[PDB]
RNA sequence: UAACUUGGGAGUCAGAACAUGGGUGAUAAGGUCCGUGUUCGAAAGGGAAACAGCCCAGACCACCAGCUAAGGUCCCAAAAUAUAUGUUAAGUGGAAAAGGAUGUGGCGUACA
RNA sequence: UUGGCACCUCGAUGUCGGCUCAUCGCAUCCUGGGGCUGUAGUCGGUCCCAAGGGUUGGGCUGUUCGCCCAUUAAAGCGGUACGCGAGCUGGGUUCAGAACGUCGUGAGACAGUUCGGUCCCUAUCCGUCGUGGGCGUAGGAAAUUUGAGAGGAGCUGUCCUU
RNA sequence: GGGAUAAGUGCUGAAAGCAUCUAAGCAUGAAGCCCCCCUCAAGAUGAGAUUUCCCAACUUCGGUUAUAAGAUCCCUCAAAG
């Protein structure tokens, strides 16, 4: 789990969400997890 | 160390509250008449009779 | 000077019986104060108490708005060191549902000796039951 | 409604904050040095919870009379739980940036 | 942390390092719970949540620092007038003696070293730790009790089996 | 051992005909949070509860006296001070 303050998609499977009011972005690779957009 | 107020009469009186003096324990003697201290003998006639 | 004044030879208080049962917490314990206070008579006088006694039931059924069932919490210290306890209001009204009003309304009345007075005229139940059926009291819709 | 001239008697030569135009410092300081206005100094009263410099306003004395200013009208605490139309769900309101997000409004230009 | 400013104290707010007793922050050294790996296992790297309890003994220097020896599950970092002198030490740094190097014509001075050299107070108020006397609780008494609310305690190693 | 949680993993499920732990609805989950363990506690003026004991003579103050059940003075001592 990336916590950063800029999160984005690393590649074009990855999909942007949001829950309990946070940014959250989840891809197939487990690597691109990202987190606190 | 010193004191850094003088003290009032109001907070002097109140702690002198206990301050006070006892009443002895005494009895009419038996035989003497006068007044006694208990367990003690008779200064006046000199009877204990225990 | 013809104002009049109050004192301890004219003064009636009531009973009350009010009912929490689906009303704001904040909105109710606002329209107790002023029953407590004696602000609603025309006898009103400052130095003397002139207001009346309330009892509220079904406490236990109050109701917050928005997410304060969480976000509100209560501390309190101990006078000792690190001595902080804490409690959420949600938690609070599922053990305790008299001390959730009783302290809500306390807050609303002035912190002097006479205001101390007042404060004790209040009885808060978590059901629909209250023992003061002698003192006669007589219902009362909030405005 | 002042100004000027002659004469008698003085005090003052340690100043401060706020707004604004500049130097200096680091477009730091409740810093420091000049221009301009106000207040304090030597100014009580109301507001800003407390708070010489901020806002309103200059107390001759008495009254259990009335209308207003700043700021206010759920309770502490005097006055609308007023009316009309819209926005925000975060306790935002009631502390801050570069950046990152089909969060949600308004006005303009075959897709699975 | 080293500085800038000079607003409080010069009819006086006592220093550095310890010792004794602690408290509190989390930017977490150890213990607990989780992602991701360039994660085979045994061991690690990095990041997130977590402050309940723990977090050694000596050699050398007046010291803080710092190095070294032997250990430990671990030998965390910061604040409180650099916590603390009406609690205590006086080894360094600011008294009067003397000496060396250096500077001065000189009396003398350190951009430096060396040996020596008085630390005083019976606690008035608040605060803290113990222990009694009054009055109250709607008659006067003797015993046994509920617990609103506070305080205390929280750690961890090595073997054996699977 | 019990009850709710943090970071986590989730189960269903639309907004957005698919996807998705969430926006409604169900779980799981820390030496930490509230209990469980030990001590003090009704001056808790909101002063609680239970068992037992005592309860008569008067000018008829809407009072008073002296007693009662009990507790002390004084005295011999300690396991306490």
Redesign the pocket.
Known sequence: ???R????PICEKC???????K?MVICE???H?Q?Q? | ?????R?SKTRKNKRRT?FKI?VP?MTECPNCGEYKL??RVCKNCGSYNG | ???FMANESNIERKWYVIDAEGQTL??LS??V??IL?G?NKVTYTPHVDTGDYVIVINASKIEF????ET??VYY?H??????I?SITAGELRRTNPERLI?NSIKG????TRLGEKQG?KLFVYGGAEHPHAAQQPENYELR
């Open positions: 789990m990336k916590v303050p800029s999160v984005k999909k942007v969400i949001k829950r309990k009011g940014v690779n487990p690597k997890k987190r957009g | 160390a010193v004191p850094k107020r003290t206990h006892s324990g208990s367990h | 000077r013809q104002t904040g909105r606002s329209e104060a002023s206070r602000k708005t928005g997410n304060k976000d509100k309190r101990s006078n000792h060191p690190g001595g306890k009783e609303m009345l002035p912190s004790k």
